[PDB]
Amino acid sequence: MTTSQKHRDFVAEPMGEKPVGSLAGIGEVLGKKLEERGFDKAYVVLGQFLVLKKDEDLFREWLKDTCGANAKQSRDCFGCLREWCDAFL
Amino acid sequence: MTTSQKHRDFVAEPMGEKPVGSLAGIGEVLGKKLEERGFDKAYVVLGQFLVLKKDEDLFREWLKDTCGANAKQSRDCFGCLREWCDAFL
């Protein structure tokens, strides 16, 4: 896979309290905008994924409409969150 | 503990897609009201717990104000959701 080693590392161990910008697909700049919106921790963003019943179209529009992420960035967060759930929830 | 065997069974294996009324503290009648509110699965309610950063006062008021659960029923869901997270998330 051409994804960063973080993608395989995140889906290989608990997420604990790592910062939101730790999720694959979210860069340092995007992490700051979400933090200003009340998502200072990744587990709060994980909850939004659960609220959307894992719907990929609703999840991608939520991130793009919420911060302006590009279509490529949204694909990395979906598979990243979907794969973590496959291992944990 | 005087809790139902479901409490120990729920915190002993994944929650999968079991119905919301499966969470300890939620009875069949309370499960129906949440379902009408869009929580047809327990993992959608688990997400609300994550959104409240596990705050016990905010979580209990959410359930009581959301369905009318009693103070005793709210205590069972908090420890039930908090213990599940301790084993999984």
From Swiss-Prot, chains A, B:
Outcome when changing residue 8 to E: Complete loss of LEMD3/MAN1 binding
Result, substituting residue 51 to E: Complete loss of EMD, and histone H1/H3 binding. Reduces dsDNA and LEMD3/MAN1 binding
Effect the entry attributes to changing residue 26 to A: Reduces histone H1/H3 and LEMD3/MAN1 binding. Fails to promote HIV-1 genome integration
Effect of residue 29 to A: No effect on histone H1/H3 binding
Effect of residue 37 to E: Reduces LEMD3/MAN1 binding
Effect seen on changing residue 8 to A: Enhances histone H1/H3 binding
Phenotype for residue 4 to D: 75% cytoplasmic localization
GO molecular function: DNA binding; double-stranded DNA binding; identical protein binding; protein homodimerization activity
Modified residues ((Microbial infection) Phosphothreonine): 2-3
Effect on the protein upon substituting residue 53 to A: No effect on LEMD3/MAN1 binding. Enhances histone H1/H3 binding
Residue ranges constituting the HhH domain according to the UniProt record: 20-35
Keywords recorded for this protein, A-Z: Acetylation, Chromosome, Cytoplasm, Disease variant, DNA-binding, Host-virus interaction, Nucleus, Osteoporosis, Phosphoprotein
Name of the molecule in the record: Barrier-to-autointegration factor
Gene name tied to this protein: BANF1
